[PDB]
């Protein structure tokens, strides 16, 4: 940037902070610690809408623009401090960092993949999931030196591209041209300044749950500095803004070189339409249920209730919060106790391939090490590995051969079905992990209370329990997934008459009291919610009416007539 560009940038930013962004600087000045790094989050879109050249100069030279932003932030903080009636009530803060957020939404700045060599030197945002975090650290970043002829104390910076290593200069940067090349270092002689900036290396990875990310996601190292450390943990969904840079080490006598593309972070953020509107108008409901059920799994004969129950599984649900602050789930649970080879496995696999953010397994083929948590270790270091019940957070988990698991794999599933969480306590890794997911299971068996190899607490853990020429020509004529995927996506973002229908049905199952009757906890109530949603969800409604609740009784009664009693 030449003088004109820097001048215009500084003037625009100074006017913007003299007009707005006053309370943030006031709160920064009101803090007690004076040696702390304080961020100032600024929307980049609204800032670039005020002036045309500021955006060009930011996209052309991001580091110097951020430095000028920090200087103007210091000036504005001093100005606001001088405008107070009692300036001694607050304290000036010199470590101010302008953190860019809210870039203009475009594929050239908002990225879902790892930036390549073309994007080196550009400021952009990358959205991913944190797979690794390092400890918080302290060490030097600038080094003071002195001249042997003029006694001028200057400072040298650490090269970020060379892993913060210092190189000895040979020119005196004093105001008077010194020909002296002999300088002395003052970094280790004393500790007069506290010039040391925070540092942390995190590792992000592309989210395979996204549509743009392919099969193998890529990883990337992100460097957080100053107040950006301790802002995330392993497993968070981050949208990191920053500059793509290159850190390298060269060849030596016995050492090989290594070049790496890293992301120096500047701000951290923790996380056909007309057709769908026309399909929703026709649905607003029984004919729409027949279309969704036929389009969900057309490779199967009959089984109208299973296609409907799966529809509610992919449909639900929405979390709630009761008076005790307890999180009340939304995600469904469907059990398919069908004879082997009836096609129940063909359902779950196509349903897992048709749905974005979806997982699946085949029971004993994946034990508790592949269902919940695993403390991956290496030396005195460890991290948390996610299983089937965890990777399906805000998604679907399918488990065929559900009764072929051990009693401890079921115990882990018992917790995921009852708390939306999974307790971690392996090696030196103890934590509480959120597993907000729906579970679509299918059992291989040996009435429907003896053939099942599941305990009665586990059978009660499911919202719906279903038991499983025109066949040859149906395959012969067979001899879409994308729209149904986009359906349940838009659809997954969407009373007294309901509660009556479900309390009356439950009371009819509770009064005639023989030896069999369990106690409801939440799996009923919140099935009734996600079913009630589903009948309105699938048809795009915001209110549960009688038709939704009546169809629920038809499915729930058919599940208790022919299936395992709750």
């Amino acid at each position: 940037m030449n003088s004109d560009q820097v001048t215009l940038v500084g003037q625009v930013f100074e006017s913007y902070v003299s007009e707005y962004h006053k309370n943030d600087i006031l709160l920064i000045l009101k803090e007690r610690d004076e040696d702390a790094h304080y961020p100032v989050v600024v929307n980049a879109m609204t800032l670039f809408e005020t002036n045309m050249e500021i955006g060009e100069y930011f996209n052309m030279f991001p580091s110097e623009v951020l430095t000028i932003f920090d200087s103007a932030l210091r000036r504005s903080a001093l100005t606001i401090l001088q405008s107070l009636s009692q300036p001694e009530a607050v304290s000036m803060k010199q470590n101010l960092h302008a953190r860019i957020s809210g870039l203009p939404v475009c594929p050239e700045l908002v990225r879902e993949h790892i930036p390549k060599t073309k994007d080196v030197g550009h400021f952009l945002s990358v959205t991913g999931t944190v797979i690794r975090t390092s400890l918080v650290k302290v060490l030097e970043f600038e080094r003071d030196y002195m001249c042997n002829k003029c006694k001028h104390v200057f400072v040298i910076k650490a090269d970020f591209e060379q892993y913060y290593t210092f190189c000895r200069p040979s020119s005196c940067p004093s105001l008077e041209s010194c020909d002296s090349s002999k300088f002395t270092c003052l970094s280790g002689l004393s500790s007069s300044p506290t010039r040391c900036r925070d540092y942390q290396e995190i590792k992000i990875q592309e989210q395979v749950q996204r549509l743009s990310v392919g099969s193998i996601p890529r990883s990337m190292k992100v460097i957080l500095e100053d107040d950006l450390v301790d802002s995330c943990k392993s497993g968070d969904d981050l949208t990191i803004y920053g500059i793509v840079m290159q850190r390298w080490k060269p060849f030596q006598q016995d050492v090989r070189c290594e070049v790496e593309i890293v992301l120096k972070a500047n701000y951290i953020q923790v996380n056909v339409q007309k057709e769908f509107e026309d399909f929703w108008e026709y649905y607003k409901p029984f004919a729409g249920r027949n279309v969704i059920l036929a389009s969900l799994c057309p490779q199967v004969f009959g089984m109208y209730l299973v296609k409907l129950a799966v529809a509610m599984v992919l449909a639900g649900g929405i979390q709630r919060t009761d008076a005790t602050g307890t999180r009340v789930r939304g995600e469904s649970h469907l059990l398919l106790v069908g004879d082997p080879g009836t096609g129940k496995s063909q359902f779950l696999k196509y349903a897992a391939k048709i749905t974005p953010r979806s997982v699946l397994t085949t029971g004993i083929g994946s034990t508790s090490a592949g269902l919940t948590v695993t403390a991956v270790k290496d030396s005195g270091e460890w991290n948390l590995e996610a299983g089937a019940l965890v990777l399906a957070d805000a998604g679907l988990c399918c488990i065929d051969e559900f009764n072929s698991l051990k009693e401890h794999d079921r115990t882990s599933i018992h917790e995921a079905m009852e708390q939306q969480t999974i307790s971690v306590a392996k090696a030196g890794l103890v934590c509480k992990l959120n597993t907000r997911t729906t579970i679509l299971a299918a059992t291989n068996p040996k009435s429907v209370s003896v053939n099942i190899a599941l305990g009665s607490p586990l059978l009660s853990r499911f919202d719906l329990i279903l038991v499983l020429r025109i066949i040859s020509s149906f395959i012969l004529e067979n001899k879409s997934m994308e729209k149904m995927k986009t359906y349940f996506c838009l659809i997954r973002n969407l009373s007294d008459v309901g509660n009556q229908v479900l309390l009356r049905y439950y009371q009819m199952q509770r009064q005639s009291d023989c030896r069999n009757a369990a106690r409801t906890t939440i799996r009923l109530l919140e099935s009734l919610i996600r079913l009630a949603e589903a009948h309105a969800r699938l048809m795009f409604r915001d209110t549960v009416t009688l038709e939704d609740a009546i169809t629920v009784v038809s499915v729930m009664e058919s599940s208790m007539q022919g299936g395992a009693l709750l």
Partner: protein, 231 residues
């Protein structure tokens, strides 16, 4: 100070340069901090409304998400408070034990793991351990020589409560817990180093029966996957 004490340390903040690691992946940090200790001090109304149905209120408030198990929650509160550590310091009369232990024999789907979680959450010093990924150093003291003794789950739970879920799946990595429940100590004998470490902890544990649902004619010592050495 010994591992487990709550100490107040005043001193200067200085840069650490060794540097540790490595690796992976990855707790190595070139950038590093430490504290130069100048001094160290080692120690070793709403309550009155609660004292004035107190037992059942604390009992039911231990785990607000576990239905039933009124007697299990009753024993958990008793283990949280604990008896009297009747150690006559002027007579060297051993206090025996004032920390009771709890065993939960139940079928799956009862919430036994949740009771152990609530045991470690409401306690001021709780340590929760699963019974599958088990190591001898995970519970006993850990020897690391170049020697140092690192506190394990039985030592980390000192003056607190340690929860052991699915201990029927633990092998020899669990037998030292029997010595801790009785001696309040851990025995160490490895690489020529012989010592005895403190372990004044309360052990609450849960296991699964032998043949699943055991509402039959057998008793506890027969249906439970456990011998009489721990019962």
């Amino acid at each position: 100070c010994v591992p487990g004490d709550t100490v107040t340390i005043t001193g200067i903040v200085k840069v650490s340069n060794a540097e540790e690691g490595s690796r992976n992946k990855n707790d190595k940090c070139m950038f590093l901090l430490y504290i130069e200790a100048n001094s160290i001090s080692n120690s070793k109304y709403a309550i009155q409304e609660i004292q004035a149905n107190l037992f059942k209120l604390i009992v039911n408030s231990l785990c607000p998400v576990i239905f039933g198990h009124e007697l299990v929650k009753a024993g958990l509160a008793l283990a949280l408070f604990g008896g009297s550590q009747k150690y006559a310091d002027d007579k060297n009369r051993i206090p025996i034990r004032g920390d009771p232990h709890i065993l939960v024999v139940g079928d799956p789907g009862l919430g036994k793991s949740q009771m152990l979680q609530a045991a470690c959450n409401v306690a001021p010093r709780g340590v929760y351990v699963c019974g599958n990924t088990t190591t001898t150093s995970g519970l006993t003291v850990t020897l690391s020589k170049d020697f140092a003794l690192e506190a394990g789950a039985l030592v980390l739970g000192d003056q607190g409560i340690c929860g052991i879920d699915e201990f029927d799946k633990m092998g020899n990595q669990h037998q030292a817990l029997l010595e801790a429940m009785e001696q309040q100590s851990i025995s160490l004998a490895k690489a020529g180093v012989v010592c005895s470490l403190p372990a004044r902890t309360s052990i609450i544990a849960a296991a699964n029966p032998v043949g699943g649902h055991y509402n039959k004619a057998k008793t506890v010592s027969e249906n439970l996957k456990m011998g009489s050495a721990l019962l």
